[PDB]
Design an enzyme around this catalytic site. Structure first.
Site: not given
Ligand SMILES: C[C@@H](Oc1cc(-c2cnn(C3CCNCC3)c2)cnc1N)c1c(Cl)ccc(F)c1Cl
Length: 289
Positions: A38, A153-154, A34, A149, A167
């Site tokens: 920040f 997406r969140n 992601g 928010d 988020d």
């Molecule tokens: C901070 C970040 O956290 C995470 C992202 C992810 C994430 C994003 N993408 N993926 C995979 C699945 C789809 N293909 C790419 C890898 C996992 C997993 N766990 C998280 N805790 C995040 C992101 Cl990047 C986007 C929205 C959110 F609400 C949050 Cl909380």
């Protein structure tokens, strides 16, 4: 490079409840999952090897920014609900911004999940996810926590397909810049197409404006991730809404669910359901499937 003694001492106490020692954490800076304003999010493992998401706060250069962000986000440690993203901890180090460590969500965000053509989630699947969000929003509401928010997406999907409302707090960021606009009263980037009409008018966010956002989120689910109001300019969303106009019924949204959606968007904030009400309502709708 960020100092420890430069912060409000009460905040340093709160952060130390959840401190992670660098030795405990391996971050894979080559594995970006992601990109926020920040900082980036990376694959990381917390050791007994927990797979985690590591949010870098390295784009926040100044200490006054870090303090404000940590102060506002630290309350996240006192939340525990299966439909709310938890905080694993904050890794503080001698050189570099604090790293925010979160549980890894294997299926990423709900929006990309449901948009994936190979997934083809059914109406039942989609309503299920929506009910899970309402439950985590119910918990947050009960803690008097206003999200600001809420959007597909969140909300994240773990390996068990449990939805985590995310988020917020130390995770808070804009991870899809396409959906934030400075065309609002505050002048700063906001998810205007998810915001309650009054929030657009008054700049104030409430639990009842989160309910409005929840209504938009449900609409995102039933459309399998269509962007809301695609032909409404960010310049026009307030007057669009003032004119009493709303998102239209998705093809495979059952009538009772759309009814629920319309209630979430009642102009009068007092008139919209509580998350308690929403849980009961959507649960009954779910049970018909
Ligand atoms: C901070 C970040 O956290 C995470 C992202 C992810 C994430 C994003 N993408 N993926 C995979 C699945 C789809 N293909 C790419 C890898 C996992 C997993 N766990 C998280 N805790 C995040 C992101 Cl990047 C986007 C929205 C959110 F609400 C949050 Cl909380």
């Amino acid at each position: 490079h960020i100092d420890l003694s430069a912060l409000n001492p009460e905040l340093v106490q709160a952060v130390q409840h959840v401190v992670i020692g660098p030795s405990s954490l391996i971050v894979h800076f080559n594995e970006v999952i992601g990109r926020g304003h920040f900082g980036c999010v990376y694959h990381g493992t917390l050791l007994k090897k927990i797979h985690c998401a590591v949010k870098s706060l390295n784009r926040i250069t100044d200490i006054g920014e870090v303090s404000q962000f940590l102060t506002e986000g630290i309350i996240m440690k006192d939340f525990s609900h299966p439909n709310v993203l938890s905080l694993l901890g904050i890794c503080l180090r001698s050189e570099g911004s604090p790293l925010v460590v979160l549980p890894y969500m294997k299926h990423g965000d709900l929006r990309n999940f449901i948009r994936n053509e190979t997934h083809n989630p059914t109406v039942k699947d989609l309503i299920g996810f929506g009910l899970q969000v309402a439950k985590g929003m119910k918990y947050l509401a009960s803690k008097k926590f206003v999200h600001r928010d809420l959007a597909a997406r969140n909300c994240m999907l773990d390996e068990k397909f449990t939805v985590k409302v995310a988020d917020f707090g130390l995770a808070r960021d804009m991870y899809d810049k396409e959906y934030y606009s400075v065309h609002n009263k505050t002048g700063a980037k906001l998810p205007v197409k998810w915001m309650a009409l009054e929030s657009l008018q008054t700049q104030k966010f409430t639990t009842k404006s989160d309910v409005w956002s929840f209504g938009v989120l449900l609409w995102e689910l039933m459309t399998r991730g269509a962007p809301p109001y695609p032909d409404v300019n960010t310049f026009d969303i307030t007057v669009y809404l003032l004119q009493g106009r709303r998102l239209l019924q998705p093809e495979y949204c059952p009538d009772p669910l759309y009814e629920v959606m319309l209630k979430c968007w009642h102009p009068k904030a007092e008139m919209r359901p509580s998350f308690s009400e929403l849980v009961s309502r959507i649960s009954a709708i779910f049970s018909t499937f």
